[PDB]
Design a protein around this nucleic acid. Structure first.
Lengths: 148, 185, 58, 51, 159, 222, 49
RNA sequence: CCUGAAAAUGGAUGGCGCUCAAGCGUGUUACCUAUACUCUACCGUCAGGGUUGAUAUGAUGCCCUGACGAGUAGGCAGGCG
RNA sequence: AUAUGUAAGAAGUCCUUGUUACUUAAUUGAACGUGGACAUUUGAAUGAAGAGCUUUUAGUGGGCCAUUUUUGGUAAGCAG
RNA sequence: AUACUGCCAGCUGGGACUGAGGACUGCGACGUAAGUCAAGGAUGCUGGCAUAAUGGUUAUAUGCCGCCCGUCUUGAAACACGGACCAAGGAGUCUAACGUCUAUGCGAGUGUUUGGGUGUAAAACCCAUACGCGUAAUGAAAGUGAACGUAGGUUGGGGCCUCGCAAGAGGUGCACAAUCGACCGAUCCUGAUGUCUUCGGAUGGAUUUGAGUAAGAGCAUAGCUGUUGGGACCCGAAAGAU
């Protein structure tokens, strides 16, 4: 769609929309992030505070596989059950027949308690769990057991 | 010569005749232009405007939001009207027997409503069923919850989510964000 | 090559183009900058009055 | 479609003013007044002519 | 070169008064200020703590905070093409109650009384204020008031 | 149901009743104007007979026309002219004389010619150059129906009712005057009577307060 | 230069990147060649998996 | 009004010319003419509306309208090749 | 003198009250309220060819000239 | 009596410009009757020609106007610069990564096209365990990690519900804005039962703080505009290297 551009509409107008006084020059302010402390400092301080300097401590050879730990909340905890058996599990809200959720094969590393699961007991297999999530599972009547 | 108090030839500033080329959306707009002209129900005018609205001004309405709206006292049996898309929400476990009229239903939300026992309705069926918007409840999704809007109005001492591609340490966490490096914002 | 130093010419016209309308006033102004001992009190008193109103008309 | 001026077009005049007919009939544009000679004070004329 | 200090060009502004120098009388301290009170700002040059800026000298604001020895004032300051809200912590020596609000409250009470009398009788109390109207007809007599004729005076040097 | 002539005859009956009301009201207005003029005359004569001076009531209404163009106007007179609705040259408006109105006119005196209009000139202005502001639109009066439709809450049911409300400045003078669109006058047909307009009327110019000569000027421009 | 509220982008294009541009026009032809090679090796080892 | 009052190509109350002026001060009045004002036609823009009718009309289709229109740098939109 | 801050109401005006860890010698105050009395004039004028803005981006960032107030300079079609 | 002012919904003329609209509709006027009319826009009568007569184009003449364009500039006809002429060519492009907006598809998900199958041999068309982004934040980091409540209270809120013959009352109030809170992380504190007696950190807080929670909104594709790196709108150095 070169035909919908303003280059097509600027045909016949001298400056091509770039001005007669301050023309289109090559690099009137510098190239890239030039002068971010000198004449682009106002833009840096307004729109990107914290840009200059270093804060934290380094980590040589940091592998993100170590820190892989996707978080699953309790409101999404029941979506790990297939939709077919989900209704049966919700209706037959009994211990000693509780569904097993293995969040590790689901793809999650930690469980957080964002709240309001039903009162159906459930066996939750999680690598890590938060205090509130464990308390809410206990209140629902299920259990969270630690896996690896 | 006239000393003009206002700008001349100033357009409306509001959308009419939506940007969409959807023939069926144009048909709905035709039906509701007729209704809003010849009915004097404010519901028809509101629905016509919402039909003109654009995508970011028509955020999805979750079935959980619909359930919360039906939890209003005296609003259990009202027809829930969404000018937009109704999306599923798995954070809820039960859904009432309502009738929801909307432009679009996701498969999950459609199945959720039908299984709950109510009905999913298209806005023209709603127009046939309640030409003056009788016993309706219009819901609108969260508009200022977009990721784009959280960078709007960014400045010093505003707390408005810088426009950044990489997030973490040594990415805008330094001079200008803490008193240990100069000043704080 | 000396140049013009300063002028406020055209500045009021520029301001009044879409300018000097009054700031938007609100019921319930922010309590930021108000005495924090008073603010502690107000937290406790508002809690108490909400509880009393809920008890009176649940 | 076309604005017709009153103060002419007696038709539009009478359309806008039913009283125009009676005004013309009784000739209220030239209406005489009863004459009664209240004589002014001499002090007023003395002040008027005073140097 | 150029100087723009905090008390720049305030030589006469904070000058105390003629024969009103020294210790301030105690009514200014005995006056109490509540949140929402409308207050005029006039800095006391004698007291240098909590002194307002020369911009806020002569400005009228609304109290938003009350502290041990001072008060918080909300002032709308014109910055460019808008007003910004400014919060000042001024001492009661520089603060003073504004009388325009007091006059308006008295008028509010007067309208309440007039409306009560209207509910009593119904005599078209006409609450709203009106501007100075053009004078009605009047008759001026000349008893002991015969017009005295004046004339332009001839020029004289007088020096 | 046919309603082909029954509704028409009923509408004609209602129109006849409305015309009767208008006729009676206009006769009352004519009597009121004549009584006021005659009573002012007789008060003057009575005071002269009694050895006093009858001071005429200060005029309660002015008509103002913008005389200057729309170029090189200072901001305060510009704003005042905008508020008086004189946004064009030869544009006129009725103003109700109060202290606020008087101090308004004093600011824009070098740009306007104003004065005290008469019943005659006001009636001619309304009949000829009479347009109402209906839904932000300038529609010629040309009929009592639209004046009634837009000013019937205030009892103004005819063009002469509006004229009377403007002349004998009434409780709803503000509403009636604002309903009246600003009068777009022509240039005076016999000229301005002065070589240069933009001196005061006292100085041999045009602008300012021609107390009663505004009638001659405006009848020339209208 | 630097301008209005925008993310800080790091476009590593300051070398002679235009010499080292590999646009994969041969995707379809190479898929065909891979299938042909698989078929030819199957014919070569005809009984083998 | 005159003296005071001298600068260089020839020379400018704009020129011709004007002397109870066609000069100066003043005072009515008539008259002349801007793309201004008033009123009409038409163009476009903006806006506020009407319009579901058995065929002969792809409903910003048809229609009622009121106001408005200078423009560099610049923006946007409808189009022409 | 000119210019300039604020106010001219419904987020408002008046009552055994209700809350509090603040405050008071003290249910005295302070703040925020529930319950009550205010209509055809809801508390000056004029206007309001709609009001509140949200995002985003162009060009511009040499200016110059009036009547006025004014600085330097003898002054300048000077400089400010 | 005349002046001179003012008014007449007072009378009598002489000229000019315009005639928009086009199937009944309205408001009025005429002895108050069927009808007429100057009343929501010109009709009636008559003549000449039917042609270059009107008109278009074109050249000239006449009256009045009219400086040479482009450019930089406060200011250009300029005694500022480029331009003798004509033809053809000739200058905001494409890409990587993005911001706002808009359209579309699906939507707590989304993206088939690295590959594989197939094919009417670069097209179709079909196929995910993965991966990217999103669905969790916060802290430098160890780490911890989002309901005291109808996902809260207050003000305002479109729409809907209940309404008497035209007021306006009540109820419910999504979006969104203002405010007071609650929850998660960080900081500073007080630290319970217990105890690898130095650990774990319950409980209660604090004019502190976060790009958070508080019934998800995103992902992908395309388009204008804007950004950065690239020859980077086109032409242009004095130089520097091998």
């Amino acid at each position: 769609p070169s035909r919908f551009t303003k280059t097509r509409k600027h045909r016949g107008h001298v400056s091509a929309g770039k001005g007669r006084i301050g023309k289109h020059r090559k690099h009137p302010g510098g190239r890239g992030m030039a002068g971010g402390q000198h004449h682009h400092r106002i833009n840096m301080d307004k729109y990107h505070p914290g840009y200059f300097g270093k804060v934290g401590m380094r980590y040589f050879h940091k592998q993100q596989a170590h820190f892989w730990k996707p978080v699953l909340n309790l409101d999404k905890l029941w979506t790990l059950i297939p939709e077919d058996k989900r209704d049966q599990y919700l209706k037959s809200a009994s211990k000693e027949t509780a569904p097993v959720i293995d969040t590790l094969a689901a793809g999650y590393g930690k469980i957080l308690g964002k709240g309001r699961i039903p009162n159906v007991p459930v066996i939750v297999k999680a690598r890590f769990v938060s205090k509130l999530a464990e308390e809410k599972i206990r209140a629902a009547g299920g259990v969270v057991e630690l896996i690896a | 010569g006239i000393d003009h108090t206002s700008k001349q030839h100033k357009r409306s500033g509001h959308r009419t005749a939506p940007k969409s080329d959807n023939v069926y959306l144009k048909l709905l707009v035709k039906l509701y232009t007729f209704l809003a002209r010849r009915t004097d129900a404010p519901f028809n005018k509101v629905v016509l405007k919402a039909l003109f609205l654009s995508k970011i001004n028509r955020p999805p309405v979750s079935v959980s939001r619909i359930a919360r709206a039906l939890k209003q006292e005296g609003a259990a049996n009202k027809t829930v009207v969404v000018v937009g898309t109704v999306t599923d929400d798995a954070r809820i476990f039960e859904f009432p027997k309502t009738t929801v009229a909307a432009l679009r239903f996701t498969a999950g939300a459609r199945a959720k409503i039908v299984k709950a026992g109510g009905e999913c309705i298209t806005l023209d069926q709603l127009a046939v069923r309640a030409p003056k918007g009788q016993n309706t409840l219009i819901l609108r999704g969260p508009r200022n919850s977009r990721e784009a809007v959280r960078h709007f109005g960014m400045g010093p001492h505003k707390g408005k989510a810088p426009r950044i591609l990489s997030t973490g340490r040594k990415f805008e966490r330094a001079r200008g964000r803490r008193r240990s490096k100069g000043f704080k914002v | 090559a000396k140049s013009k130093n300063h002028t406020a010419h055209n500045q009021t016209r520029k301001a009044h183009r879409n300018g000097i309308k009054k700031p938007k006033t609100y019921k319930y102004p922010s309590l930021k900058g108000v005495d924090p001992k008073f603010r502690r009190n107000h937290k406790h008193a508002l809690h108490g009055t909400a509880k009393a109103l809920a008890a009176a008309k649940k | 479609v076309l604005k017709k001026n009153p103060l002419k077009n007696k038709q539009v005049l009478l359309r806008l003013n039913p009283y125009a007919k009676v005004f013309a009939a009784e000739k209220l544009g030239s209406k005489k007044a009863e004459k009664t000679g209240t004589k002014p004070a001499a002090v007023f004329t003395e002040t008027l002519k005073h140097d | 070169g150029k100087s723009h200090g905090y008390r720049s060009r305030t030589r006469y502004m904070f000058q105390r008064d003629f024969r009103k120098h020294g210790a301030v009388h105690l009514s200014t301290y005995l006056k109490v200020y509540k949140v929402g009170d409308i207050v005029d700002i006039k800095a006391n040059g004698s007291i240098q703590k909590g002194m307002p800026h020369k911009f806020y000298q002569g400005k009228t604001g609304v109290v938003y905070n009350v502290t041990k020895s001072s008060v918080g004032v909300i002032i709308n300051k014109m910055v460019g093409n808008r007003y910004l809200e400014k919060r000042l912590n001024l001492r009661v020596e520089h603060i003073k109650h504004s009388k325009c609000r007091q006059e308006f409250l008295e008028r509010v009470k007067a309208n309440a009384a007039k409306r009560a009398e209207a509910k009593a009788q119904g005599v078209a109390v006409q609450l709203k204020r009106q501007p100075a109207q053009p004078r009605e007809s009047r008759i001026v007599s000349t008893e002991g008031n015969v017009p005295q004729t004046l004339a332009p005076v001839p020029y004289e040097t007088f020096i | 149901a046919e309603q082909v002539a029954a509704e028409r005859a009923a509408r004609k009956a209602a129109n006849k009743e409305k015309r009767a009301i208008i006729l009676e009201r206009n006769a009352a207005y004519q009597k009121e104007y004549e009584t006021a003029e005659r009573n002012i005359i007789q008060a003057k004569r009575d005071a002269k007979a009694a050895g006093s001076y009858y001071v005429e009531a200060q005029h309660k209404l002015v008509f103002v026309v913008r005389i200057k163009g729309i170029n090189k106007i200072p901001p305060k007179p510009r704003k005042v002219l905008q508020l008086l609705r004189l946004t064009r040259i030869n544009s006129g408006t009725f103003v109700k004389v109060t202290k606020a109105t008087l101090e308004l006119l004093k600011l824009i005196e070098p740009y306007v010619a104003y004065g005290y209009p008469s019943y005659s000139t006001i009636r001619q202005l309304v009949y000829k150059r009479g347009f109402g502001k209906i839904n932000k639109q300038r529609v010629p009066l040309s009929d009592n129906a639209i004046i009634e439709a837009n000013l019937g809450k205030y009892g103004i049911l005819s063009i002469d009712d509006l004229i009377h409300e403007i002349i004998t400045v009434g409780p709803h003078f503000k509403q009636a005057n604002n309903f009246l669109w600003p009068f777009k006058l022509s240039n005076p047909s016999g000229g301005w009577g002065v070589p240069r307009k933009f001196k005061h009327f006292i100085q041999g110019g045009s602008f300012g307060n021609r107390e009663e000569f505004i009638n001659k000027l405006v009848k020339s421009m209208n | 230069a630097i301008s209005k509220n925008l993310p800080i982008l790091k476009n590593h294009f300051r070398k002679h990147w235009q010499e080292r541009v590999k646009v994969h026009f041969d995707q379809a032809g190479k898929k065909v060649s891979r299938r042909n090679a698989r078929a030819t090796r199957a014919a070569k080892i005809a009984p083998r998996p």
